[PDB]
């Protein structure tokens, strides 16, 4: 049931916050992203935290080829992530690479917030970023990531230790994937 | 009257803010400063003496408390008691209750404070929901003489659910029950 | 008025560009008055000067002028080693409000220099909005934990970054209702 | 049986009291079997020895016997510099479960020795209750973050305290359902 996947992964996300586990994960590396993905989809996907080995094609979207995935992710790891502009760059490339069979979008948005929090003492205020504008920026980010960088730059918050802001980002993050959730 | 309902509901709101903003773990563990950090935030817009040591003598209800003349220095002595072991930790809790450094709010603020010591030093907190009001207040009074009862009642009701927000709420509910206030939700 | 505004801003840039800032005493009222003297030198007759009349109006409860010089020495004696100590001193220093004008902007440069030396960070003021800041400052009279949370969440290690210093200037002035460019 | 349990405990204290423990290789299967060999000396014919049958206990998912020696070299090759790396190695070692019996107890002494050398801590196992430990070990096959949190929260720098070493023995044996004394 989808309702398992939703209710349980949301519970796991709250546990990451309440147990202070988010800050234990490596910053801005594929390792840190799979630590998030692994805990998120713990008893849900058998590939939790695991790189895919088949190719996936959504549509008009070229992702990293399965044959070169592990090496490509190492290249992404070594991109810099000190400035905002670098951080969205790395996010844009990790999304293009799409290392997981499923759960890339939700897990990467948690991962992005942690880079911003550690490096710029901000997180994304996803609640003010509507679904249509966000998904469009993400699609266009395969050519030009200017629109995405602006949309995110216009919606930062300094409430980086605020559990209710974290909840609000979970709500909107799942909305981006067509799941309407509560608390 | 109604300003009592303000006291209660706003202090409970402040307690949930300490969790939800991750302020609890920012406060100093097991010292009077840490206790007064909790008291001050709990009673922020409620008590004009929030976080402040009293300057007149309680010594109320037939019980002997620290005299105001020597209060600040006595609190320093309590600060240097060790709190590594369960036995030490309850000793510190007992001696600080005896000192009773605030005009009001000692009971609720010290139980949050006890939990933080236990969390940091033993990865547990008190499961106050299973410690009844009668047994707790009796052990507290008796701890003036002998704190064996208090140590036992607490040891028998520890929980490792130290990152569980709902357990935290259950401990707010019971802590205010001990002081004669029936609150809900939070 | 907008001349005097702009001239204090130009003095703030001279303090960075001439490397005068690292000359000043750290975390004392003398250091603060050094900043306040240079900031407002041909703007306020009292630049760098302790005030001799009580502040303005309202239900504002800043230090009494007659005891100001002595209370400032007690403020000077507070420690400024930890983050918690540094904000404690900032909070008490703002309560005493030692100048006739220029307390907010001068004290913010001052607090940045304390944090820079003691902890190799400054406040990235551009990320702290005016409403939350002034609320935290007013509430620090009753309890300063929120102020400490607001500032700590907003620290930056870009302590030699000239553009951070500029952005801090512009926001610092907005806190006081001053629109400033470049 | 109760003689065997008690004999292995006697062996564990000999390892401490004779300072044999620090003789053993750190963080390798070789070091582990050194522990397991001395531990179960007159107790298991296979003491210190890789098993040759699969542990077809239930639907437990350990390393197949046929590939056990090679996968053990792969485990050996994992790093054990950081806490995160060290639990990762413990998790993969427990998954391979290289002994017919005695995996849990021998591996806990072995893990304490890694942590002691690399981080100057050991696990204060007495504060880790049995229910939470076994769930974390079982779940570490899917995600080992909870296990890492449990263990990290219970590190102690009392690395030469023989009374801590004794309490870890008592708790380690309870994890396997043996009620031992002193
Ligand atoms: N067509 C597309 N081109 C580029 N990026 C795309 C895309 N369709 C989706 N995405 C990105 O991938 C994410 C969803 O990937 P998916 O693996 O399903 O994650 P999920 N829905 O399981 O959380 C979106 O949030 C978006 O960032
Ligand atoms: N007679 C007494 N002797 C010793 N301790 C006593 C006592 N009466 C109450 N206490 C303790 O002090 C706490 C009350 O704190 P207090 O400042 O007087 O009340 P409150 N409701 O403002 O929190 C109780 O929770 C109890 O633990
Ligand atoms: N009511 C108040 N209580 C305490 N502090 C207050 C306050 N209103 C303002 N403040 C603080 O004082 C500063 C204003 O000081 P002021 O003397 O006007 O300096 P200025 N505007 O010339 O830079 C503000 O930045 C704020 O931090
Ligand atoms: N189902 C399981 N999956 C993974 N690990 C498991 C498990 N059941 C038990 N374990 C682990 O293996 C240990 C038991 O191994 P065993 O070979 O029986 O050792 P022992 N010392 O009891 O004689 C436990 O302490 C636990 O860490
Ligand atoms: Mg999916
Ligand atoms: Mg009351
Ligand atoms: Mg002016
Ligand atoms: Mg045996």
Contact assessment for residue C151 and residue C121, using Cβ atoms and an 8 Å cutoff: no
The residue to mutate among D103, D140, D146, having the most atoms of ligand 4 within 8 angstroms of its beta carbon, is D103
**In the structure encoding, which two tokens stand for residue B2, read together?**
């109604």
Alpha helices (H) along A98-155: 104-120, 131-140, 146-153
Closest CA to A157 of D34, C153, C90: C153
Is B40 in a helix, a strand, or coil? helix
Q: Within 13 Å and on the Cβ side, how many CA atoms surround C90?
A: 29
Contact assessment for residue C127 and residue C85, using Cβ atoms and an 8 Å cutoff: no
* Residue carrying structure tokens 């949930």: B16
Q: Is the CB of B60 under 6 A from ligand 2?
A: no
Locate the ligand 1 atom nearest the alpha carbon of residue A101 and give its number: 17
H/E element holding D155?
Answer: strand D155-156
Kindly state whether D120 is in contact with chain B, defined as any CB-CB distance less than 8 angstroms: no
Cα–Cα distance for residue pair A98/A93, rounded to 1 Å: 9
Which residue in C142, C148, C149 is closest to B50 by CB distance?
C142
Please answer yes or no on whether C156 and A121 come within 8 Å at the CB atom: yes
Domain spanning B3-178, CATH architecture: Orthogonal Bundle (1.10)
Contact assessment for residue D102 and residue D40, using Cβ atoms and an 8 Å cutoff: yes
Cα–Cα distance for residue pair C75/C105, rounded to 1 Å: 19
Neighbours of chain D (3+ CB pairs under 8 A): A, B
B17, B35, B37, B49: best to mutate for the C interface, most C CBs within 10 A? B37
Indicate the DSSP class of residue A22.
Answer: G
Kindly state whether B123 is in contact with chain D, defined as any CB-CB distance less than 8 angstroms: yes
Cα–Cα distance for residue pair A67/C80, rounded to 1 Å: 56
Cα–Cα distance for residue pair A134/A131, rounded to 1 Å: 5
Contact list, A13 vs chain D (CB under 8 Å): none
Cα–Cα distance for residue pair D62/D95, rounded to 1 Å: 5
Q: Which fold has domain D2-175?
A: Fic-like fold (1.10.3290)
In angstroms, what CA-CA distances link B151 with B89, B135, B158, B161, C14?
10, 12, 11, 20, 64
Kindly state whether A122 is in contact with chain C, defined as any CB-CB distance less than 8 angstroms: yes
Closest residue in D to A26 (Cα) is D84
In angstroms, what CA-CA distances link C38 with C3, C35, C46?
16, 5, 11
* Sequential DSSP letters for A67-81: GGHHHHHHHHHTS--
- The ligand that comes nearest to the alpha carbon of residue C61 is 3
Sequence-distant (≥ 6) Cβ neighbours of residue C147 within 8 angstroms: C87, C91, C136, C137, C139, C140
Sequence-distant (≥ 6) Cβ neighbours of residue B167 within 8 angstroms: B125, B127, B129, B159, B161
Kindly state whether D146 is in contact with chain B, defined as any CB-CB distance less than 8 angstroms: no
Q: Is the CB of D138 under 6 A from ligand 4?
A: yes
Buried/exposed C138-155: b ≥16 CB within 10 Å, e otherwise = eebebbbbbbbbbbbbbb
Cα–Cα distance for residue pair A124/C97, rounded to 1 Å: 36
Locate the ligand 3 atom nearest the alpha carbon of residue C60 and give its number: 1
Sequence-distant (≥ 6) Cβ neighbours of residue D159 within 8 angstroms: D116, D120, D121, D122
Sequence-distant (≥ 6) Cβ neighbours of residue C59 within 8 angstroms: none
Burial of residue C21 (number of CB atoms within 10 Å: 0-12, 13-18, 19+): buried
The residue to mutate among D94, D108, D146, having the most atoms of ligand 4 within 8 angstroms of its beta carbon, is D94
Sequence-distant (≥ 6) Cβ neighbours of residue D74 within 8 angstroms: none
Locate the ligand 1 atom nearest the alpha carbon of residue A141 and give its number: 4
Cα–Cα distance for residue pair C91/D76, rounded to 1 Å: 56
* Residue carrying structure tokens 């046929």: D66
Sequence-distant (≥ 6) Cβ neighbours of residue D19 within 8 angstroms: none
- A 10 A CB-CB count for D147 gives 21
Four-CA torsion D80, D83, D84, D88, nearest 10 degrees: 50
Sequence-distant (≥ 6) Cβ neighbours of residue D174 within 8 angstroms: D130, D180
Locate the ligand 1 atom nearest the alpha carbon of residue A176 and give its number: 25
Buried/exposed B93-125: b ≥16 CB within 10 Å, e otherwise = bbbbbebbbbbbbbbbbbbbbbbbbbbebbbbb
H/E element holding A145?
Answer: none
Contact assessment for residue C178 and residue C3, using Cβ atoms and an 8 Å cutoff: no
The residue to mutate among A104, A110, A132, having the most atoms of ligand 1 within 8 angstroms of its beta carbon, is A104
Buried/exposed A63-99: b ≥16 CB within 10 Å, e otherwise = bbeeeebeebbeebbeeebeebeebbbbbbbbbbbbb
Q: Within 13 Å and on the Cβ side, how many CA atoms surround A133?
A: 15
Contact list, C143 vs chain B (CB under 8 Å): 40-41, 44, 50-51
Closest CA to C172 of C104, C110, C70: C104
**In the structure encoding, which two tokens stand for residue D139, read together?**
């779940």
- What pairs with residue A156 in β-bridges? A124
Ligand 1: residues within 6 Å at CB? Answer: A 58, 61, 95, 100, 102-106, 138-139, 142, 176-177
Class of domain A2-176: mainly alpha
């Amino acid at each position: 049931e989808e309702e398992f996947e939703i209710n349980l992964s949301v519970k796991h996300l709250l546990e990451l916050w309440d147990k202070n586990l988010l800050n234990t994960f490596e910053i801005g590396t594929f390792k840190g992203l799979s630590q998030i993905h692994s805990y998120m989809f713990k008893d849900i996907f058998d590939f939790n935290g695991q790189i895919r080995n088949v190719n996936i094609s959504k549509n008009n979207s070229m992702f990293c080829l399965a044959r070169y995935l592990k090496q490509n992710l190492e290249i992404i790891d070594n991109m810099k992530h000190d400035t905002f502009d670098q951080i969205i760059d790395k996010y844009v490339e990790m999304n293009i690479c799409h290392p997981f069979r499923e759960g890339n979008g939700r897990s990467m948005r948690i991962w992005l917030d942690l880079i911003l929090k550690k490096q710029l003492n901000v997180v994304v205020n996803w609640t003010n970023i509507n679904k249509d504008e966000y998904l469009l920026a993400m699609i266009n980010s395969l050519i030009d990531s200017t629109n995405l960088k602006l949309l995110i730059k216009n919606n930062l918050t300094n409430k980086i230790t605020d559990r209710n802001v974290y909840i609000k980002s979970i709500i909107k993050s799942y909305e981006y994937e067509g799941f309407k959730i509560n608390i």
